[PDB]
Amino acid sequence: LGKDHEILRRRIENGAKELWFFLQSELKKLKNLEGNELQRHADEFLLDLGHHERSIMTDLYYLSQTDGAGDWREKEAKDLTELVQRRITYLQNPKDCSKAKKLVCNINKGCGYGCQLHHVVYCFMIAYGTQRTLILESQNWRYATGGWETVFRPVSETCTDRSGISTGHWSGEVKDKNVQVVELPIVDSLHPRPPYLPLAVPEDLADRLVRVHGDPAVWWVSQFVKYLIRPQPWLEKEIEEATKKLGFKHPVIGVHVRRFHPIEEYMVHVEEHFQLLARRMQVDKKRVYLATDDPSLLKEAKTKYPNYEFISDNSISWSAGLHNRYTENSLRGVILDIHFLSQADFLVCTFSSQVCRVAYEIMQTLHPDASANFHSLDDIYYFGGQNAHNQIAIYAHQPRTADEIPMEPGDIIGVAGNHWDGYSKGVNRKLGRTGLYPSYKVREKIETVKYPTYPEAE
Amino acid sequence: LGKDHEILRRRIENGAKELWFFLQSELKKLKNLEGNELQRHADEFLLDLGHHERSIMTDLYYLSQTDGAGDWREKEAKDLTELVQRRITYLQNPKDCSKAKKLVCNINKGCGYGCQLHHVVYCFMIAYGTQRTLILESQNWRYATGGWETVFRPVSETCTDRSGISTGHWSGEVKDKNVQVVELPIVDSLHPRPPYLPLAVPEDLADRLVRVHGDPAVWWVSQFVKYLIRPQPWLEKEIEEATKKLGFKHPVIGVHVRRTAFHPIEEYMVHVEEHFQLLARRMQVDKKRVYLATDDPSLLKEAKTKYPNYEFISDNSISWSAGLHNRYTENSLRGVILDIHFLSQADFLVCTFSSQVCRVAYEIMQTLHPDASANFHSLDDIYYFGGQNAHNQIAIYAHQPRTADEIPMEPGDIIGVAGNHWDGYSKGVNRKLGRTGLYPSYKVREKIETVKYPTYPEAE
């Protein structure tokens, strides 16, 4: 046992105990107050509770790093991603492309870039589960009519055509067993649905992922996002150029405001996380990378928060003007916004937005475990077309109001979202009742699927 | 890293985060309430907070045990005890008693049993640090005039005689280097004071102690209590007989109510009930049992009627099991020994640490578990040893006072702690500023003190 590990564990334990002592005393005094004197004491109470709670979270962070734990998690998370990327590269590059089993995906889904990119991810994951090389068709792509390879590297180096003896639309893995080239439609009306969909994770990787990562579902999704967005050299140059031009530097918190939530809703979580980071590092300046579709928000945020340095992409052209002809005008902004949001140390946004979801997923590829480096103002993490997200009640709950649902340990709860107020909303599937329940009284139900493991990739 | 260790660490982290969400939401609702709506909401707020807080503590307990941590902590605590007890046994049993350096302690201090036992402990710790065999003088002991050896084993098997070529009262370890037999007085007016006193721990054990125990100071004190209270075979049979006669079984919480400051029984039982609610999260509590030791003869009846679901066990004996032993021990010694025993054997201790008896029980409790430093709640004082050196802390987070009763602090300020008010604030002196007042208990860290004790390597 590590000495620092035990010191930190006891201070976390005693810190939470002193917090319980503090809460009982101040709440007792709070009961004998009225009116304006009650307002001040409650506000001072909350300010004192914030620093106390952040000291517990700080010791918890030190605990996750102490006695070689941080180095092991970086090493283990690096081996897991290198294993998956090697499996994907092996699948994507068969020796003879003319006799390879293939799955065809068309990027031209009737939606925006964030939704279109998630379409190819859902394509890629199903291709991975069916042992089919992913062939991406992207002619007349709305963001770059030259195709996908105009911006990113091709999804394969040896097999990029759709030649084969037989071709058919998706109708089932067993039914399409002897169909060489299977065309996959959008997830909206896919039938039959294979098991190779979020939020399940590969059964052969589940034990190692749960040990290393707080949300293995996003990590699995992120491995296909990571492979897809391997940039062409010109784009890699542009990204490095924008980093120098914009002065993107750490520490920095990414904020994505899609437009309704005022800027103050986003900033109260930015200010709170900067106070947390200040407990364990020097914060030279509070930096926020602002990505928004509201052009009047940048000047609103700068004047409302004069002690914050706001970094944002306002360019009307690529660094090299030659690239303006091959990419649609709005592709530059979304690629840069998603990049810098994914590079940030913390992400404040709304997970109902595809753009923040993509940035959150890429963030998981840049750190051993960045599952908690976010705060969404509405939805929890999800993937379009995922199977049902279920939780398991660990502690009993008896409803206080009619809006709450009862829970017994072992009950399967289908969560709709987290209200970030101590309660979550969902359906108790054992009863068919939908309502609120304490968020701490449930745990996540991690699903697994028997994927191919591709032993030849070694 | 172990999988359960990582799952528990995250659930503790996420459980604390959801607690912060819950606190922010409900406190914002409380700001817009009046009268009975405010009272009823806060009470339901407290009830929800308690269960939520106990789930975090429960996960923290599981964290302390996962992936072989519990078994390792037990074997390491066992090795540290057997090492110290070997060193004490080696010192106390020299081959040639006539030539051995000695320290003479007289048990007949003008105070009660708890105070007298701690006097010998303070003797034994100094004798350990000065490499002198402890010679215990206990004739006309007010609890057993036949001597200390009437109840417990003698402190030595080979050297209980006080012969030496020279003798003198304590005048300092340097001046007494050639005084073979040194008489040590009470700690009250001891001059000069040696470094072998609480709350410092031996520096050769300090690293392993901090790694394994939450309060190494009590553990170091408990080693000398453990060696002294080695019972004679008849006392060992009495304790075994009283255990069966009282029905003492686990789980059980020890409660000591000394009333000769007054605390109502509810002041103790709120922490008794809270700890049983905690234990009910990780074990099936067949019955809420309490061992009650008190100097108030009417309290046992009061506790039974006010808490009908509790099984109250207490010492009520008028004599030993074997009546022969009544003739050699004073009547009150039986109750104190049995109370200290069963309080120390309890899974949790609720009392007032200003009472010597509860402190003795808390110290002995440390010899019964790997780390029982947190298995208590005192209604007043924090732990202390009579005559200890200044108990200091180190401020780790800055504090700006809100009221005139608070003191400011900066990281690194040595804080002399006077006590913990158990309301989030402690009371002490900022020695840098010379100011005394309140400060948040979580903003300071314990300052562990070390002393170069002899290590007695020949004892291996």
Coordinates of C-alpha atoms in Angstrom, one line a residue, chain A residues 24-437:
Chain A
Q24 CA -25.8 20.0 10.1
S25 CA -24.7 23.0 12.1
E26 CA -25.3 25.6 9.5
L27 CA -28.7 24.1 8.4
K28 CA -29.8 24.2 12.1
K29 CA -28.9 27.9 12.3
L30 CA -30.6 28.4 8.9
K31 CA -33.9 27.2 10.3
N32 CA -34.0 30.1 12.8
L33 CA -33.5 32.8 10.2
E34 CA -36.0 34.9 8.2
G35 CA -36.1 37.1 5.1
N36 CA -33.0 39.0 4.2
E37 CA -30.8 37.6 7.0
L38 CA -31.7 34.2 5.6
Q39 CA -30.6 35.2 2.1
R40 CA -27.1 36.3 3.2
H41 CA -26.4 33.3 5.5
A42 CA -27.5 30.9 2.7
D43 CA -25.3 32.6 0.2
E44 CA -22.3 32.6 2.5
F45 CA -23.2 28.9 3.2
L46 CA -23.0 28.1 -0.5
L47 CA -19.7 29.9 -1.0
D48 CA -18.1 28.0 2.0
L49 CA -19.5 24.7 0.7
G50 CA -18.0 25.3 -2.8
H51 CA -14.5 25.6 -1.5
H52 CA -14.9 22.7 0.9
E53 CA -16.4 20.4 -1.8
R54 CA -13.6 21.4 -4.2
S55 CA -10.9 20.4 -1.7
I56 CA -12.5 17.0 -1.6
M57 CA -12.5 16.8 -5.4
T58 CA -8.9 17.9 -5.4
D59 CA -7.8 15.2 -3.0
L60 CA -9.8 12.7 -5.1
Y61 CA -7.9 13.8 -8.2
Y62 CA -4.5 13.4 -6.3
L63 CA -5.8 10.0 -5.2
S64 CA -6.4 8.9 -8.9
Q65 CA -2.7 9.9 -9.7
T66 CA -0.8 8.8 -6.6
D67 CA 1.6 5.9 -6.3
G68 CA 2.0 5.3 -10.0
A69 CA -1.8 5.2 -10.7
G70 CA -1.6 8.1 -13.1
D71 CA 1.3 6.5 -15.1
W72 CA -0.4 3.1 -15.2
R73 CA -3.7 4.6 -16.5
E74 CA -1.9 6.5 -19.2
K75 CA 0.0 3.3 -20.2
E76 CA -3.1 1.1 -20.1
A77 CA -5.4 3.6 -22.0
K78 CA -2.6 3.9 -24.6
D79 CA -2.4 0.2 -25.1
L80 CA -6.2 -0.1 -25.5
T81 CA -6.4 2.6 -28.2
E82 CA -3.4 1.3 -30.0
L83 CA -5.0 -2.2 -30.0
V84 CA -8.3 -0.9 -31.4
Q85 CA -6.7 1.3 -34.0
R86 CA -4.5 -1.6 -35.1
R87 CA -7.6 -3.8 -35.4
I88 CA -9.4 -1.2 -37.5
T89 CA -6.3 -0.7 -39.7
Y90 CA -6.1 -4.4 -40.3
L91 CA -9.8 -4.6 -41.2
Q92 CA -9.6 -1.6 -43.5
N93 CA -6.6 -2.9 -45.5
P94 CA -7.2 -6.4 -47.0
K95 CA -4.5 -7.8 -49.3
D96 CA -6.9 -8.4 -52.2
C97 CA -9.6 -5.7 -52.5
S98 CA -11.5 -7.5 -55.3
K99 CA -12.4 -10.5 -53.0
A100 CA -12.9 -8.6 -49.7
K101 CA -16.2 -8.4 -47.8
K102 CA -17.3 -4.8 -47.8
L103 CA -19.8 -2.5 -46.3
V104 CA -20.7 0.7 -48.3
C105 CA -21.5 4.0 -46.5
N106 CA -22.8 7.2 -48.2
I107 CA -21.9 10.4 -46.3
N108 CA -24.7 12.4 -47.9
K109 CA -27.2 12.2 -45.1
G110 CA -29.7 15.0 -45.0
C111 CA -28.2 16.8 -42.1
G112 CA -25.2 18.9 -40.9
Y113 CA -21.5 18.0 -40.5
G114 CA -21.8 16.8 -37.0
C115 CA -24.7 14.5 -37.9
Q116 CA -23.0 13.3 -41.1
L117 CA -19.8 12.4 -39.3
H118 CA -21.8 10.4 -36.8
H119 CA -23.4 8.6 -39.7
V120 CA -20.0 7.3 -40.9
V121 CA -19.2 6.3 -37.3
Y122 CA -22.3 4.2 -37.1
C123 CA -21.3 2.8 -40.5
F124 CA -17.8 2.1 -39.3
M125 CA -18.8 0.4 -36.0
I126 CA -21.2 -2.0 -37.9
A127 CA -18.5 -2.6 -40.5
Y128 CA -16.2 -3.5 -37.6
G129 CA -18.7 -5.9 -36.1
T130 CA -19.5 -7.7 -39.4
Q131 CA -15.8 -8.0 -40.5
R132 CA -16.5 -5.9 -43.6
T133 CA -14.1 -3.3 -45.0
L134 CA -15.7 0.1 -44.8
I135 CA -16.0 1.8 -48.3
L136 CA -17.0 5.4 -47.9
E137 CA -18.8 7.1 -50.9
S138 CA -18.7 10.9 -50.6
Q139 CA -19.1 12.3 -54.2
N140 CA -20.9 15.7 -54.2
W141 CA -20.4 16.0 -50.4
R142 CA -22.0 19.3 -49.5
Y143 CA -19.0 20.5 -47.5
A144 CA -16.4 19.5 -50.1
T145 CA -17.7 18.3 -53.5
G146 CA -14.3 16.7 -54.2
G147 CA -15.1 14.1 -51.6
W148 CA -14.2 13.0 -48.1
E149 CA -10.5 12.5 -49.0
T150 CA -10.3 16.2 -49.9
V151 CA -10.2 17.0 -46.1
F152 CA -9.2 13.8 -44.3
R153 CA -7.2 10.7 -45.2
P154 CA -9.0 7.9 -47.0
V155 CA -10.4 5.2 -44.7
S156 CA -8.2 2.7 -46.4
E157 CA -4.8 2.5 -48.2
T158 CA -5.4 -0.7 -50.2
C159 CA -9.2 -1.1 -50.7
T160 CA -11.2 1.9 -51.7
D161 CA -13.5 0.6 -54.4
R162 CA -16.8 -1.5 -54.3
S163 CA -16.0 -4.2 -56.7
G164 CA -17.4 -7.6 -55.9
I165 CA -19.4 -10.6 -57.2
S166 CA -22.6 -9.7 -55.4
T167 CA -24.2 -6.5 -54.0
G168 CA -27.3 -6.0 -51.9
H169 CA -28.8 -3.7 -49.4
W170 CA -28.5 -4.5 -45.7
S171 CA -30.9 -7.2 -44.6
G172 CA -29.1 -9.0 -41.7
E173 CA -25.7 -10.4 -41.0
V174 CA -26.8 -14.0 -41.4
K175 CA -28.8 -13.3 -44.5
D176 CA -26.0 -11.2 -46.1
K177 CA -23.4 -13.8 -45.2
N178 CA -22.6 -14.6 -48.9
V179 CA -23.2 -11.0 -50.1
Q180 CA -19.8 -9.5 -50.8
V181 CA -20.8 -5.8 -50.9
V182 CA -23.5 -4.7 -48.5
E183 CA -24.9 -1.2 -48.7
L184 CA -25.9 0.3 -45.3
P185 CA -28.7 2.9 -45.0
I186 CA -29.1 5.6 -42.4
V187 CA -29.8 4.4 -38.8
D188 CA -33.2 6.0 -38.8
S189 CA -35.0 3.0 -40.3
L190 CA -32.3 0.3 -40.2
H191 CA -33.8 -3.2 -40.1
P192 CA -32.8 -5.5 -38.8
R193 CA -30.6 -3.8 -36.2
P194 CA -27.3 -5.6 -35.4
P195 CA -25.9 -5.6 -31.9
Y196 CA -22.9 -3.5 -33.0
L197 CA -24.3 -0.2 -31.8
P198 CA -23.8 2.2 -28.9
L199 CA -23.9 2.2 -26.0
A200 CA -22.6 -1.3 -25.8
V201 CA -18.8 -2.0 -25.7
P202 CA -16.9 -4.9 -27.0
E203 CA -17.2 -7.9 -24.7
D204 CA -13.5 -8.7 -25.0
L205 CA -12.5 -5.1 -23.9
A206 CA -15.1 -4.4 -21.2
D207 CA -13.1 -5.5 -18.2
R208 CA -10.1 -3.4 -19.1
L209 CA -12.2 -0.4 -20.1
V210 CA -14.2 -0.2 -16.9
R211 CA -11.0 -0.4 -15.0
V212 CA -9.5 2.5 -17.0
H213 CA -12.4 4.7 -18.1
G214 CA -15.5 6.2 -16.5
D215 CA -17.7 5.9 -19.6
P216 CA -16.5 3.0 -21.8
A217 CA -19.4 3.7 -24.2
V218 CA -17.9 7.0 -25.4
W219 CA -14.4 5.6 -25.5
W220 CA -15.6 2.9 -27.9
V221 CA -17.4 5.5 -30.1
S222 CA -14.3 7.7 -30.0
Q223 CA -12.1 5.1 -31.5
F224 CA -14.0 5.3 -34.8
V225 CA -14.1 9.1 -34.7
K226 CA -10.3 9.0 -34.1
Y227 CA -9.7 6.8 -37.2
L228 CA -12.0 8.8 -39.4
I229 CA -10.6 12.3 -38.8
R230 CA -7.0 11.6 -39.6
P231 CA -6.3 14.9 -41.4
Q232 CA -4.7 15.4 -44.8
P233 CA -1.3 17.2 -44.6
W234 CA -2.8 20.5 -45.8
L235 CA -5.5 20.5 -43.1
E236 CA -2.9 19.4 -40.5
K237 CA -0.9 22.5 -41.5
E238 CA -4.0 24.7 -41.3
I239 CA -4.8 23.4 -37.8
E240 CA -1.3 24.1 -36.6
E241 CA -1.5 27.5 -38.2
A242 CA -4.7 28.4 -36.4
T243 CA -3.3 27.3 -33.1
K244 CA -0.5 29.9 -33.4
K245 CA -2.7 32.6 -34.8
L246 CA -5.5 32.3 -32.2
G247 CA -3.0 31.8 -29.4
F248 CA -4.7 28.6 -28.2
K249 CA -2.9 27.8 -24.9
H250 CA -3.6 25.9 -21.7
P251 CA -5.3 26.0 -19.3
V252 CA -8.4 26.6 -21.5
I253 CA -12.1 25.7 -21.2
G254 CA -14.2 25.1 -24.3
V255 CA -17.7 26.6 -24.5
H256 CA -20.2 25.8 -27.2
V257 CA -23.4 27.9 -27.3
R258 CA -25.9 26.7 -30.0
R259 CA -28.8 29.0 -30.8
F260 CA -31.8 29.0 -25.4
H261 CA -29.4 29.5 -22.5
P262 CA -27.8 32.8 -21.5
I263 CA -24.0 33.1 -21.4
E264 CA -24.2 33.2 -17.6
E265 CA -25.5 29.6 -17.5
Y266 CA -22.3 28.5 -19.3
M267 CA -20.0 30.7 -17.3
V268 CA -21.0 29.6 -13.8
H269 CA -19.6 26.2 -14.7
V270 CA -16.5 27.7 -16.3
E271 CA -15.8 29.8 -13.3
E272 CA -16.4 26.8 -11.0
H273 CA -14.0 24.5 -12.9
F274 CA -11.3 27.3 -13.0
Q275 CA -11.6 27.5 -9.2
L276 CA -11.1 23.7 -9.0
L277 CA -8.0 23.9 -11.3
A278 CA -6.6 26.8 -9.2
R279 CA -6.5 24.4 -6.3
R280 CA -3.8 22.2 -8.0
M281 CA -2.1 24.5 -10.5
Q282 CA -1.3 28.1 -11.4
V283 CA -4.0 29.7 -13.5
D284 CA -2.1 32.5 -15.3
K285 CA -5.3 33.7 -17.1
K286 CA -8.8 32.3 -17.4
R287 CA -9.1 31.3 -21.1
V288 CA -12.3 30.3 -22.8
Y289 CA -12.5 29.0 -26.4
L290 CA -16.0 30.2 -27.5
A291 CA -17.6 28.4 -30.4
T292 CA -21.1 29.7 -31.3
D293 CA -23.5 30.3 -34.1
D294 CA -24.5 33.7 -32.6
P295 CA -22.2 36.4 -34.0
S296 CA -23.2 38.9 -31.2
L297 CA -22.2 36.6 -28.4
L298 CA -18.4 37.1 -28.6
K299 CA -18.6 40.8 -27.8
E300 CA -21.3 40.1 -25.2
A301 CA -19.1 37.6 -23.3
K302 CA -16.0 39.8 -23.5
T303 CA -17.6 42.8 -22.0
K304 CA -19.6 40.8 -19.4
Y305 CA -16.4 39.0 -18.3
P306 CA -13.5 41.5 -18.7
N307 CA -11.1 39.2 -16.7
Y308 CA -11.6 36.4 -19.2
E309 CA -9.6 36.0 -22.4
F310 CA -12.0 34.8 -25.1
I311 CA -10.4 32.9 -28.0
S312 CA -12.6 32.1 -31.1
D313 CA -12.3 31.4 -34.8
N314 CA -13.5 34.4 -36.8
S315 CA -11.5 33.7 -40.0
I316 CA -13.2 34.2 -43.4
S317 CA -10.6 32.1 -45.2
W318 CA -8.1 29.3 -44.8
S319 CA -4.5 30.2 -44.2
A320 CA -3.7 29.1 -47.8
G321 CA -6.3 30.7 -50.0
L322 CA -6.1 27.9 -52.6
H323 CA -8.1 25.6 -50.2
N324 CA -11.1 28.0 -50.2
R325 CA -12.1 26.5 -53.6
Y326 CA -12.3 22.9 -52.5
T327 CA -14.1 23.4 -49.2
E328 CA -17.5 24.9 -48.5
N329 CA -17.3 28.2 -46.5
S330 CA -18.8 26.8 -43.3
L331 CA -16.6 23.6 -43.2
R332 CA -13.6 25.6 -41.9
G333 CA -15.4 27.0 -38.9
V334 CA -16.9 23.7 -37.7
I335 CA -13.6 21.7 -38.1
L336 CA -11.7 24.3 -36.2
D337 CA -14.4 24.8 -33.5
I338 CA -14.6 21.0 -32.9
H339 CA -10.8 20.7 -32.8
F340 CA -10.2 23.4 -30.2
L341 CA -13.2 22.4 -28.1
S342 CA -11.8 18.8 -28.1
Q343 CA -8.4 20.1 -27.1
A344 CA -9.7 22.0 -24.1
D345 CA -9.3 20.9 -20.5
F346 CA -13.0 21.2 -19.8
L347 CA -16.1 21.4 -22.0
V348 CA -19.2 23.4 -21.1
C349 CA -22.1 23.1 -23.6
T350 CA -25.4 21.3 -24.4
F351 CA -25.0 17.7 -25.4
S352 CA -28.1 18.0 -27.5
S353 CA -25.7 19.7 -30.0
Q354 CA -24.0 17.3 -32.4
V355 CA -20.9 19.6 -32.5
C356 CA -20.2 19.4 -28.7
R357 CA -20.8 15.6 -28.7
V358 CA -18.2 15.2 -31.5
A359 CA -15.7 17.4 -29.5
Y360 CA -16.5 15.4 -26.3
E361 CA -15.8 12.2 -28.1
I362 CA -12.5 13.3 -29.6
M363 CA -11.5 14.5 -26.1
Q364 CA -11.5 10.9 -25.0
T365 CA -8.7 10.1 -27.4
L366 CA -6.5 12.9 -26.0
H367 CA -6.4 11.8 -22.3
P368 CA -6.5 8.5 -20.3
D369 CA -9.9 9.2 -18.8
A370 CA -11.7 12.5 -19.8
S371 CA -15.2 11.1 -19.3
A372 CA -15.9 13.7 -16.5
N373 CA -14.3 16.7 -18.2
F374 CA -17.6 18.2 -19.3
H375 CA -20.8 19.8 -18.1
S376 CA -23.9 19.6 -20.3
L377 CA -26.7 22.1 -19.7
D378 CA -29.3 19.6 -20.9
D379 CA -28.9 16.0 -22.1
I380 CA -26.5 13.4 -20.8
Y381 CA -24.2 11.8 -23.4
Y382 CA -25.9 9.8 -26.1
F383 CA -25.4 8.6 -29.7
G384 CA -28.1 8.9 -32.3
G385 CA -29.7 5.6 -32.9
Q386 CA -28.3 4.0 -29.7
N387 CA -30.1 1.2 -27.9
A388 CA -31.9 1.9 -24.6
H389 CA -29.7 3.5 -21.9
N390 CA -30.4 1.6 -18.7
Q391 CA -29.3 2.0 -15.1
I392 CA -29.5 -0.3 -12.1
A393 CA -30.9 1.0 -8.8
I394 CA -28.4 0.3 -6.0
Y395 CA -30.3 1.9 -3.0
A396 CA -34.0 2.0 -2.3
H397 CA -36.0 5.1 -2.8
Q398 CA -39.4 5.9 -1.4
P399 CA -41.2 8.7 -3.3
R400 CA -41.8 12.0 -1.4
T401 CA -44.0 13.5 -4.2
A402 CA -46.1 12.1 -7.0
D403 CA -43.4 13.1 -9.5
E404 CA -40.9 10.7 -8.0
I405 CA -40.7 7.0 -8.7
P406 CA -40.0 4.2 -6.2
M407 CA -36.9 2.1 -6.6
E408 CA -35.7 -1.2 -5.1
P409 CA -32.1 -2.4 -5.4
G410 CA -31.8 -4.3 -8.7
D411 CA -34.5 -2.5 -10.6
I412 CA -33.6 -1.6 -14.2
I413 CA -34.2 2.2 -14.8
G414 CA -34.2 3.6 -18.3
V415 CA -32.7 7.1 -17.8
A416 CA -33.9 10.0 -19.9
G417 CA -31.6 12.6 -18.5
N418 CA -29.9 14.2 -15.5
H419 CA -31.4 17.4 -14.2
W420 CA -28.1 18.3 -12.5
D421 CA -30.0 19.1 -9.2
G422 CA -29.5 15.8 -7.4
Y423 CA -32.3 14.1 -9.4
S424 CA -32.6 12.2 -12.7
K425 CA -35.6 11.4 -14.8
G426 CA -36.3 7.9 -16.1
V427 CA -38.7 5.0 -16.2
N428 CA -38.8 2.1 -13.7
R429 CA -39.2 -0.7 -16.2
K430 CA -40.4 -3.1 -13.5
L431 CA -43.4 -0.8 -12.8
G432 CA -43.8 1.3 -16.0
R433 CA -43.8 4.5 -13.9
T434 CA -41.8 7.5 -15.2
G435 CA -40.5 10.1 -12.8
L436 CA -37.7 11.5 -10.8
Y437 CA -35.2 9.7 -8.6

